[PDB]
């Protein structure tokens, strides 16, 4: 094609992310009259999301996904998006990104500093905790070998609840669980399904601890080369795909505990009061480390009412 473009992702071929990216690719191909074709590179073929962001920056990858929280790698205050229990729901995550001074400035920096244009934002689920033994209360976390991604906020989740974290890439998790090299992991329900972690985890606990969004990102090196009518095709398709993406996650969060129970997983509902209590020292550390910019981002986000209006 005129524009042979590539979209990399950690998510696999059985995921909502992939299905939404397929929708995006199809609409772009159609509405561009075949000028643009977007090929997909799932399951961390191209590296992880840190690597794929670097490839968007240098122009060697055209599209990828990232959470708003992942920009904590560059702007420490952006960890606010994944401080456990801070962002209440997706309504808050949307307004945090688009309708705060903090979020608007973040978007501008992503463009200026990181070489990426934000096309759209979707919901990517609320993280829960699976394990090889029941989590009936916070006590059960103590010393649980809890896999986390290579992200400071998830490592802190594990530390502050009393678990023993083991960081590793998404691709490595299934084997780690299967072999009981670790005792558990944490991810939204849809990823537990997509990755078939339910095959290798007997328990799932509704810890509700981190709220993931998902940004459709394009390399500025690519976006600038598309004539404006094709930029519009891409942007509009990313917006349409993000709405679909969100819906996939919303619908699964109603349908998936019963799916897992039919697969033999035991579901628990530990009291979250002490989980939330355990994060208070972590918030204080975040404020100490990130200074006024972190205190301001918190304040801006804590001011957002979570009820749709
Ligand atoms: C956009 C993206 O790649 N998301 C991935 C996230 C983030 O890397 C992580 O939350 C840090 O931001 O990690 C996973 O949940 C994980 O490894 O368990 C896989 C998921 O596909």
Author numbering: 1 to 309
What's written in the study?
Tripartite ATP-independent periplasmic (TRAP) transporters are secondary transporters that have evolved an obligate dependence on a substrate-binding protein (SBP) to confer unidirectional transport. We investigated the significance of this interaction using the sialic acid-specific SBP, SiaP, from the Haemophilus influenzae virulence-related SiaPQM TRAP transporter. The first structure of a TRAP SBP revealed that the charge of the carboxylate group of the ligand, sialic acid, was neutralized by an arginine residue, Arg-147, in SiaP, which sequence analysis had revealed to be the most highly conserved residue, being present in 98% of TRAP SBPs of the common DctP family.
We attempted to crystallize the wild-type protein with this non-cognate sialylamide ligand and were able to collect data to atomic resolution of 1.05 Å where ab initio phasing was applied to remove any model bias. Mass spectrometry data confirmed the presence of trace amounts of Neu5Ac in the sialylamide sample despite purification after synthesis using silica and ion-exchange chromatography and checked by one-dimensional 1H NMR. The finding that the wild-type protein was able to selectively bind this minor contaminating component, while R147E protein exposed to the same stock crystallized with the bound sialylamide, confirms the important role of the Arg-147 residue in the selectivity of SiaP for its cognate ligand. Crystallization of the wild-type SiaP with the same preparation of sialylamide revealed that the arginine is able to “fish out” even the minimal amounts of Neu5Ac present in this sialylamide preparation, analogous to conditions of limited environmental nutrients. These data also suggest that sialylamide probably is not a true ligand for wild-type SiaP, and binding detected in Muller et al. was likely due to this low level of contamination with Neu5Ac. Binding of N-acetylneuraminic acid (Neu5Ac) to C-terminally hexahistidine-tagged wild-type SiaP-His6 yielded a KD of 0.14 ± 0.04 μm, in close agreement with published data for native or N-terminally His-tagged versions.
